[PDB]
Amino acid sequence: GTTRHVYDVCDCLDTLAKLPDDSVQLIICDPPYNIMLADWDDHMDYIGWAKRWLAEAERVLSPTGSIAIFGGLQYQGEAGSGDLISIISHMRQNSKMLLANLIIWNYPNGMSAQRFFANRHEEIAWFAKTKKYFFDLDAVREPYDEETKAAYMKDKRLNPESVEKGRNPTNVWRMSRLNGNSLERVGHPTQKPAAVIERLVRALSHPGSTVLDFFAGSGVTARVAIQEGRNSICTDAAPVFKEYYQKQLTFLQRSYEIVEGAANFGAALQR
Numbered sequence: 001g002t003t004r005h006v007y008d009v010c011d012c013l014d015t016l017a018k019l020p021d022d023s024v025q026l027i028i029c030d031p032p033y034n035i036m037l038a039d040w041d042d043h044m045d046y047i048g049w050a051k052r053w054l055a056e057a058e059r060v061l062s063p064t065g066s067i068a069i070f071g072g073l074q075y076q077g078e079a080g081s082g083d084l085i086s087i088i089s090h091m092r093q094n095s096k097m098l099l100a101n102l103i104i105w106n107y108p109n110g111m112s113a114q115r116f117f118a119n120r121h122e123e124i125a126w127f128a129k130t131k132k133y134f135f136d137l138d139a140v141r142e143p144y145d146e147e148t149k150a151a152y153m154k155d156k157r158l159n160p161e162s163v164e165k166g167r168n169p170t171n172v173w174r175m176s177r178l179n180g181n182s183l184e185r186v187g188h189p190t191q192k193p194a195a196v197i198e199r200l201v202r203a204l205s206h207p208g209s210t211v212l213d214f215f216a217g218s219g220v221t222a223r224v225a226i227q228e229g230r231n232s233i234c235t236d237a238a239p240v241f242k243e244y245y246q247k248q249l250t251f252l253q254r255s256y257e258i259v260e261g262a263a264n265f266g267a268a269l270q271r
C-alpha cells in the first residue's frame with residue numbers, strides 16, 4: 001500500500017479553502033495562540049481569527065473524522081491571544097462536534113518555580129465530528145509484562161481477551177518532550193515528539209486515510225503518517241517549513257510518494 005504526502009508553504013485558510021467537504025479523516029492541530037499585528041484589521045480577539053479555521057477544519061473532516069487540538073490552560077488575558085480554553089468555549093457555543101476527550105500530556109521534566117507548582121502538562125482536546133467517529137483502541141493499548149499478564153490470566157474474574165490486548169492508555173499520557181540533543185530534532189522551537197503524534201494517528205485514523213496538518217511546524221505529522229501507512233497533507237506559513245519537512249524525510253531513510261505544491265493536495269485525498 002503506497003501512500004502519498006503533499007506539503008507546501010501557505011496560510012492555513014488558503015490550504016483549507018482548497019480542500020473539499022468531508023475529505024479528511026484526522027487533523028493534527030497545534031496552532032499559534034496569538035494573532036498577528038496585521039490581524040487587528042479584521043479581528044478584536046484570538047477566537048475571532050481562530051473560529052475561521054476551526055469552522056473550516058470541521059467542514060473538511062469526514063463524518064467519521066476527528067481533530068486533535070494541542071494547547072495549554074495558562075492564558076493570561078492579553079488582547080489578541082488565548083489558549084485551549086478559549087477554543088473549547090467557542091466550540092461549545094458554535095460547533096456540533098463532540099469533545100470525545102481532554103487529554104493531559106504530562107511530561108517528566110521542565111523549569112522550576114518558587115511561587116507556584118512547576119508546570120508539567122499540556123493539553124490535547126480531541127473533537128470528533130460526529131458520534132460515528134473512528135477509534136482504534138487496540139492499536140494504542142499498552143501490553144502488560146508476561147508476569148502481570150499471567151497473574152491476570154489466572155483471575156477468572158477478568159476477561160482473558162482484554163488482558164492479552166493490553167490496557168487502555170487512559171487520557172493522561174506520561175511522555176517526554178524533545179530535548180536539544182534529540183535525534184529527531186530539526187530546529188523548530190516547538191517541535192512535538194513523534195511518540196505523541198503516533199498515538200493520535202494510530203487511534204484516530206485508519207490505514208490509508210488522510211491526515212491533515214495546517215500548522216505543520218517541524219513536519220512531524222508527515223513522518224508519522226508515512227511510518228504508519230496513512231496519507232498526509234502538511235502546510236505551514238513559514239518558508240523554513242520546507243527545510244524541516246525535508247529533514248523529517250531523512251529520518252525515514254515501505255511505499256510512499258512525496259509531492260510538493262498545494263495544487264497537488266488531491267494526491268493525498270485519494271483513498
Ligand SMILES: Nc1ncnc2c1ncn2[C@@H]1O[C@H](C[C@@H](N)CC[C@H](N)C(=O)O)[C@@H](O)[C@H]1O
Pocket residue numbers: 010011012013030031032033070071190214215216217218235236237238
Ligand atoms: N496563519 C497561519 N497559517 C499557517 N501556519 C501558521 C499561521 N500562523 C502561524 N503558523 C505556523 O504555525 C506554527 C505554530 C507553532 N509555533 C504552534 C506551537 C504551540 N501551539 C505554541 O504556540 O507554543 C508555526 O510553525 C507557524 O509558522
Ligand SMILES: [Cl-]
Pocket residue numbers: 100101102103171
Ligand atoms: Cl476526558
Ligand SMILES: [Cl-]
Pocket residue numbers: 188190191192216217218219220
Ligand atoms: Cl512540530
